[PDB]
Amino acid sequence: KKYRLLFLSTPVGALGSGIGGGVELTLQNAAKALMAKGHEVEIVAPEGSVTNVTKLTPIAGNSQVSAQTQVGTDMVVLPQDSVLENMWSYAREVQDQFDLLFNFAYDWLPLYLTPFFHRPIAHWISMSSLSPVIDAMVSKTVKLCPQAIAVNTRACADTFSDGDRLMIMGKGIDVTQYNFVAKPEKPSLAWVGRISPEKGLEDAAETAQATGLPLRVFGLIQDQAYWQQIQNDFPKAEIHYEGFLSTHELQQKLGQSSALLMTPRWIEAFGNAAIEAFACGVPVISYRSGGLTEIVRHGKTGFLVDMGSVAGLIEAVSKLETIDRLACRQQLEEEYSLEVWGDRLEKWFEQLITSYT
Amino acid sequence: KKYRLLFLSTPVGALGSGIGGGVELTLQNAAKALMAKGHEVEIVAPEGSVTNVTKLTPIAGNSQVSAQTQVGTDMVVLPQDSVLENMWSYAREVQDQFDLLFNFAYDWLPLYLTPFFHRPIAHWISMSSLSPVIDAMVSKTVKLCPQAIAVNTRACADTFSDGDRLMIMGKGIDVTQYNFVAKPEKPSLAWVGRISPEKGLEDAAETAQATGLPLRVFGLIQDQAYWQQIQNDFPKAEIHYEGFLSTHELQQKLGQSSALLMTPRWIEAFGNAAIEAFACGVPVISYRSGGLTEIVRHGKTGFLVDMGSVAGLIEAVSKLETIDRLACRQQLEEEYSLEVWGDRLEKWFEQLITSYT
Ligand SMILES: O=c1ccn([C@@H]2O[C@H](COP(=O)(O)OP(=O)(O)O)[C@@H](O)[C@H]2O)c(=O)[nH]1
Numbered sequence: 143k144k145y146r147l148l149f150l151s152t153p154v155g156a157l158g159s160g161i162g163g164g165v166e167l168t169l170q171n172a173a174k175a176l177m178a179k180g181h182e183v184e185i186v187a188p189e190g191s192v193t194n195v196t197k198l199t200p201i202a203g204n205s206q207v208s209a210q211t212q213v214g215t216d217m218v219v220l221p222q223d224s225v226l227e228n229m230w231s232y233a234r235e236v237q238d239q240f241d242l243l244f245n246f247a248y249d250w251l252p253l254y255l256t257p258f259f260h261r262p263i264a265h266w267i268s269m270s271s272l273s274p275v276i277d278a279m280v281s282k283t284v285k286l287c288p289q290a291i292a293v294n295t296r297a298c299a300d301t302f303s304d305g306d307r308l309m310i311m312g313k314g315i316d317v318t319q320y321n322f323v324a325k326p327e328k329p330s331l332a333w334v335g336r337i338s339p340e341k342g343l344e345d346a347a348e349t350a351q352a353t354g355l356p357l358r359v360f361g362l363i364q365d366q367a368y369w370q371q372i373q374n375d376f377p378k379a380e381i382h383y384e385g386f387l388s389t390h391e392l393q394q395k396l397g398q399s400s401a402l403l404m405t406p407r408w409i410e411a412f413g414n415a416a417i418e419a420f421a422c423g424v425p426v427i428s429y430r431s432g433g434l435t436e437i438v439r440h441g442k443t444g445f446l447v448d449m450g451s452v453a454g455l456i457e458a459v460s461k462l463e464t465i466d467r468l469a470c471r472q473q474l475e476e477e478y479s480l481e482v483w484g485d486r487l488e489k490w491f492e493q494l495i496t497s498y499t
Numbered sequence: 500k501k502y503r504l505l506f507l508s509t510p511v512g513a514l515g516s517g518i519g520g521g522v523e524l525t526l527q528n529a530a531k532a533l534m535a536k537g538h539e540v541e542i543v544a545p546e547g548s549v550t551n552v553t554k555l556t557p558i559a560g561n562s563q564v565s566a567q568t569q570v571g572t573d574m575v576v577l578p579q580d581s582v583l584e585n586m587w588s589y590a591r592e593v594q595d596q597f598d599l600l601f602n603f604a605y606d607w608l609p610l611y612l613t614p615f616f617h618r619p620i621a622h623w624i625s626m627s628s629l630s631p632v633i634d635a636m637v638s639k640t641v642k643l644c645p646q647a648i649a650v651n652t653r654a655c656a657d658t659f660s661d662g663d664r665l666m667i668m669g670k671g672i673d674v675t676q677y678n679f680v681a682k683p684e685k686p687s688l689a690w691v692g693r694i695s696p697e698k699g700l701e702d703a704a705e706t707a708q709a710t711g712l713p714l715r716v717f718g719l720i721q722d723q724a725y726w727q728q729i730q731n732d733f734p735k736a737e738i739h740y741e742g743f744l745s746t747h748e749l750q751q752k753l754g755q756s757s758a759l760l761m762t763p764r765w766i767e768a769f770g771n772a773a774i775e776a777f778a779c780g781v782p783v784i785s786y787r788s789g790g791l792t793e794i795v796r797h798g799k800t801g802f803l804v805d806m807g808s809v810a811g812l813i814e815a816v817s818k819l820e821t822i823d824r825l826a827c828r829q830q831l832e833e834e835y836s837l838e839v840w841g842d843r844l845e846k847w848f849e850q851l852i853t854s855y856t
């Protein structure tokens with residue numbers, strides 16, 4: 143069973159720019175995983191996208207707003223000549239040249255188009271339920287196409303009204319791109335995500351000030367004032383902005399961290415930064431939020447802290463020495479490998495393709 | 500050649516409520532025309548719709564905003580669980596039970612869905628180009644499906660960037676519902692449309708005040724203040740609001756008018772109120788706007804006046820006596836009859852169905 147797959151990307155930004163968030167990496171690694179199994183993968187993505195994984199056809203159009211800026215919304219908004227439209231018009235054109243289409247966009251349109259196609263479409267939902275519109279579409283589409291929508295974790299599937307019908311497909315990273323670090327040069331803390339008020343970067347800064355550890359912040363700045371508000375609310379904290387890096391430059395510096403702090407105020411579906419941290423030997427200290435409670439093994443690969451408890455973060459940092467950095471790396475080698483992930487996806491696609499009609 | 504046709508309605512409101520404007524009538528009369536030729540017609544329309552023309556399947560969902568409120572827009576907005584979505588999901592379901600789908604909604608989605616269907620879809624565009632989004636979609640769809648999009652008049656087709664590829668299909672009214680009136684009891688003026696600032700009801704009121712003729716206003720009030728602003732800017736004018744009536748109650752009172760005033764500030768694609776006026780023997784006095792210049796035969800069935808010339812309206816009213824009311828009725832009997840219109844549409848659909856693939 144060797145298949146031809148069409149991977150349809152997020153319309154939020156171009157692959158390799160970070161503006162698309164963690165999906166940019168799960169899309170390319172699913173590509174690597176499935177090709178490792180001998181499948182052809184074509185990536186459809188907005189103009190400016192870059193990748194060395196496989197064939198990428200770029201599509202012109204207007205970029206889409208991030209669903210994280212429209213939380214709880216009851217309306218669907220598409221810009222004129224949207225890349226999302228254009229990618230799915232392209233998909234409609236070439237659909238007969240592929241065995242299955244794999245959608246990564248967290249958007250009303252691909253879900254709506256699903257039954258208008260005459261090819262199996264699988265959906266990767268990358269985030270918890272952020273709106274009644276996306277929640278309602280997930281319900282309608284899985285009822286029409288059972289087993290066609292997947293999520294990272296069960297905690298993610300729980301955020302959806304009909305999560306019980308979602309497939310839990312785990313995650314995978316390309317472990318070859320991450321170097322294990324046993325002893326960082328200088329003890330320090332890391333924070334990896336988009337700099338926005340609902341990421342909780344305020345709690346991490348405060349933990350850094352309290353423990354005297356330097357904070358290195360990895361991510362893209364969306365609110366240039368919110369980045370000054372943090373530095374002006376915690377002026378004794380040594381905070382370094384590393385910008386948005388490539389996976390290679392990111393793992394290089396991440397591995398020099400004593401631990402990664404994750405401070406979600408919402409329900410994090412899955413922590414891509416958490417898995418990458420583990421790959422570098424960096425233990426993970428996170429609030430009990432969504433998939434993270436399933437990632438972090440409390441007292442073995444990090445610590446789970448009650449939501450929004452800055453005091454609890456500070457206490458876990460002071461326990462860091464009790465975590466064997468190698469346990470983190472080994473947990474990531476056993477689960478979250480492309481091999482196992484690529485296998486799950488393969489037997490998933492293989493069932494959809496076989497039963498389509 | 501006897502066909503099964505699916506008529507998809509406007510999502511702006513329910514048929515028979517007027518909120519949908521003039522399309523509510525052109526849809527039902529196209530139904531009557533094509534059935535008169537021996538074709539089956541099913542109407543898909545939002546919940547609350549009413550009709551005695553044929554089978555109407557109502558569809559639940561959230562109503563859509565009128566494109567007239569979003570002029571020049573560069574975005575497409577769909578409410579959660581929109582009737583428009585739901586009508587076109589229904590259409591996708593039953594499409595194989597029909598020979599052709601006839602869309603009346605002035606909306607991005609039906610145009611976008613056109614090639615995702617496997618049945619010929621014809622489009623009735625009811626208005627001039629009101630946005631770059633609808634203009635761009637009309638271009639893309641007619642290039643994919645030549646001869647599948649139609650408009651009222653050539654003046655309407657000119658508003659579109661690729662109007663040269665649009666079909667000009669005229670219009671038809673059910674003449675049996677309109678009684679000719681040769682001499683109204685009291686001389687008076689009429690105005691038929693939606694009460695909004697771009698309809699120019701201010702110029703008609705002023706014409707009424709100046710000529711001492713009473714103004715009867717037919718339409719739905721959208722801005723309850725704009726209806727007081729007019730009555731408080733022209734307080735010597737005798738203005739009567741007749742509300743929104745049915746075709747029977749409308750023709751009954753319209754026929755008692757010495758003339759219908761039309762004061763478009765935009766480019767009116769076609770004047771449904773104008774044709775109905777003619778049916779009642781009421782001459783039409785209109786600015787030189789869009790299709791109206793083709794409707795009104797200057798000095799034979801009414802008068803064309805330079806855009807926004809209130810003085811020119813006043814002068815034409817004082818010439819009313821020179822118009823033979825019967826010429827108006829006879830122009831409407833010769834053109835704008837269901838028979839001729841139903842014939843054009845039939846030979847139109849018949850060509851699309853035959854050449855589809
Ligand atoms: O300087 C950088 C370079 C890359 N990434 C990537 O940003 C993604 C974070 O995804 P996650 O699921 O952990 O949460 P998200 O921020 O997407 O909500 C990860 O793939 C990182 O590799 C980052 O955060 N900062």
Ligand SMILES: O=c1ccn([C@@H]2O[C@H](COP(=O)(O)OP(=O)(O)O)[C@@H](O)[C@H]2O)c(=O)[nH]1
Pocket residue numbers: 517520521522524691692693717718719741742743744745746749769770771772773775
């Ligand atoms: O009290 C009423 C009852 C019905 N109509 C109908 O409103 C439509 C006016 O359409 P037109 O194309 O002339 O311009 P529009 O107002 O739709 O832009 C016509 O079908 C009328 O029959 C009206 O205007 N007032």
